[PDB]
């Protein structure tokens, strides 16, 4: 805790920008953009990239493999890794929960079963009893830890990182047609009392002053098997942890008398929010590197008008370390990560130009996922900041939610470190 | 020098030979779930603080509202201010986000689906076929290791396996008709028989919930609550650690059922439904039954929630454990003396139920659970005083004498600070989290 104190910077977003920067349309990510969406499977059939990746998972199971060229102990072990991966995603919609105000990501609590059951108490209808940002910051961070965050930070909302247009589906489209009917929808800020969705726009109130960012730690032993199946499993379980975090915390904020917008992988760019909220620093590979977990940590965030004290950004030397390290760039199976210096100009449509960062080719990264049948993660696994076969993982150390008691003390929290 | 705590060594020392530890006689019958104090008509209605008779949880709601308005965190317990009182109830209410009508008891509804076929996750993964491909592993030894590893990923702090004893499965469940939307669920609850038949998969008809005769095993999970929050019982922060753990139970069930299905087997979730969690936990070796009626575990005492999953997956049953709880409960009686409703007996165990809420025919301490429930509207919470005062809930019970582990007999002789004090992820305590580390050796023998 006093380590993190040592590295607090003075207030101010540390992301350097120029006058070319514009908000970024979510459809441009490699996951969704038409130029990157379709990729061949191992048979040469072109399909949506995740369906070709499915074909590789099936082929690996039948051939008793945990990953590309990686023989499992037997077919049973191969099957178990994919079963664990698939199960981890149970509380996540279509890989990331990105559709705003759909399924688990509702922008109002009013229709949720938990809100209905609690309606006679009227917590969501009662004006706030606490408006002091200091007390609120302590309450909401305590709640965040109950809700499964291993790290939590607060920043003013920088609209530069909010997607200009979200990827979503029409509100009456049933789940079974969702993947075939994704659309783009603008996210705008207006003078309205509550977050609201019209036919035309997702409307965030101008009072939405703050963003709360959570880090959800992944399991080191499993991530070290990247690009094989157990790295996929710790990824997947943490997405469901993100979803529960967003819902738990939004409900807490609503029952305190404020509004709250969940996001998971939607709404805006998590790495930028996490850096501004002080969880860590941007890195060569492009992830937020944290002191506690390096880049081996997932991110989610919640937007709110609840008064809060912003945390300070931290500087523990990541930028200078990544300058000379280049280990992620040398081991990346697709050569997606640059060995060059940071610029303001993106490599392709998948990058947001106008901000100083290491510019990576994220279509090359995604191209390796159908090939390998997984979500790679080699850059995370080799990064020195992540530090301190698959049969040995299944036979080896585990604990609740994949957390490690050898390090869990480092995320203990008292009021002194919350506000 | 002090020997470092070894939770695995403790469980090995107190393991007992195979066999259900629960002593029963011939008057034992399966228990209709409607008989619980939460649901039965004799106990369901309680007065609020104005003397109005209402469903008990609605009278409890009225008391929460009154406490917030009066700046209290519990009965005659002043909060630091109204904002603190409000914060405690907001945290409690939020905790329940992934739980239907206080316990997820309706089988094969909402989160508790008996088949994965309609779930969004199953649909998304359908092209891989994991739920339709026959199992690639049938060896119960490897399956036990796989499923326990998955259980820990899924949020279990403790996990154990038992053969399914049908004595503890409810004869009839409380549920709602399949065509009833959530908004009307509380007004449309019904009973439905739980039966065992020669069918390939768990199935529900208009008249019965059908568990297959092949459903051999039950997997029991312990979900640890937070010590500092539970010690505020009967006040609001004990309600909050209870509530959050119910949503953790729900996630566990769904995660684990999907893993089992994707391994080629079927899985039935339950949370507080389907059967009696304390008996399953005892038979799976998580702990022992206690005077208060809860399962007491070596790691957490009774300050741990339970859920369970039923499956045909071949597994190795765990051994029951006997670390002397019965003998300590015979002479302790702290929970009985501190219980604000006098619900817990100070007398001997018997086979005769105290009232309709107890299942007769099994040797246990017989408590009056209508008296317990009656205190919840009075206090505006879920009490928990018995859990809070139990010496096993405290985290330093265990000492090593140079030869073996033993219980320290010396143990049996506010809310602002909680909000301002120690916390960690999911409320777990890093000073004890090493106790639940797991390697293959302690997952399967
Ligand atoms: O972050 C992500 C998103 C989609 C998938 I498929 C895997 C990892
Ligand atoms: O053209 C296509 C085909 C499948 C999908 I899913 C989306 C677009
Ligand atoms: O061509 C396309 C496909 C998906 C989306 I969202 C937008 C345009
Ligand atoms: O265990 C339980 C069940 C219902 C309620 I309301 C509180 C605690
Ligand atoms: O066209 C398809 C088929 C399967 C899935 I999963 C999504 C889109
Ligand atoms: O609001 C209400 C009223 C009766 C019942 I039964 C449940 C909820
Ligand atoms: O009369 C009753 C009472 C409880 C239930 I569940 C159904 C019918
Ligand atoms: S591997 Fe090295 S260069 Fe890449 S993100 Fe990690 S520290 Fe930076
Ligand atoms: S996930 Fe793999 S392919 Fe993608 S950038 Fe990292 S190392 Fe390269
Ligand atoms: S308080 Fe004492 S008698 Fe009651 S359950 Fe705990 S050990 Fe047993
Ligand atoms: S929860 Fe409270 S009222 Fe109920 S048995 Fe325990 S101490 Fe008594």
Curated annotation (Swiss-Prot), chain B:
Binding note for cofactor: Binds 2 [4Fe-4S] clusters. The corrinoid cofactor is norpseudovitamin B12 (norpseudo-B12), a natural B12 cofactor that lacks a characteristic methyl group of the cobamide structure. In vitro, can function with singly substituted benzimidazolyl-norcobamides cofactors.
Activity versus pH: the note is: Optimum pH is about 8.0.
Protein topology in the membrane: Peripheral membrane protein
Temperature dependence (free text)? Optimum temperature is 42 degrees Celsius.
Gene Ontology MF terms in the entry? 4 iron, 4 sulfur cluster binding; metal ion binding; oxidoreductase activity
Which cellular compartments is it found in?
A: Cytoplasm; Cell inner membrane
Q: Which family does it belong to?
A: Belongs to the PceA family.
NCBIfam families linked: RDH
Q: What is this protein called?
A: Tetrachloroethene reductive dehalogenase
Annotated source species: Sulfurospirillum multivorans
